[PDB]
Every structure is written in structure tokens, then in C-alpha cells.
Amino acid sequence: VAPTLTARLYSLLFRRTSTFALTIVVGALFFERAFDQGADAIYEHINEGKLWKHIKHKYENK
């Protein structure tokens, strides 16, 4: 037997609230970045070539 993913997670990080906070601090960081990266991408896909990001080419450095 092994601990369910949760139980592993539990005994490594949540027993002590100090560890529990730490976790949350670090996940708040990591999560921001993926969310933004993913979420941004998603958005930018829906308006392909509509946004300057897509269009800076025309008048840029010749």
C-alpha cells in the first residue's frame, strides 16, 4: 500500500499550518504564471491577427 495522492500531500504539506501557508504562498506564485500564460494564449488565439501583437510587422524596421 501507498498513501492516496491526497494523503501523501496531506502528511507532507498540510499537517503543519506553517507548511500549509508556505505551500499556498508558492502555489499562489506558480499558479498566477500558468494561469496568465494559458489564459492569455487562449484569449489571443480568439482574435488572431486582430491585436497589435499580431500586427506590429507591417511598419517595423523597414
Binding site: 503543519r16 506553517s18 507548511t19 501557508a21 508556505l22 504562498v25 508558492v26 499562489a28 506564485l29
Partner: peptide
């Protein structure tokens, strides 16, 4: 006692919080 350990994780948290947050 357990305070050092706990104060150490509490110090960690504040640190990473500032660093990131700020």
C-alpha cells in the same frame, strides 16, 4: 521549542510572500 521550526516556516512564508507578492 517547536517555535524555532514554526518560526522558521513563518519566516519563510513572509519572505516568499514579499518577494512574490511585491
Amino acid at each position: 521549542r517547536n517555535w524555532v521550526p514554526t518560526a522558521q516556516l513563518w519566516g519563510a512564508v513572509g519572505a516568499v510572500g514579499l518577494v512574490s507578492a511585491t
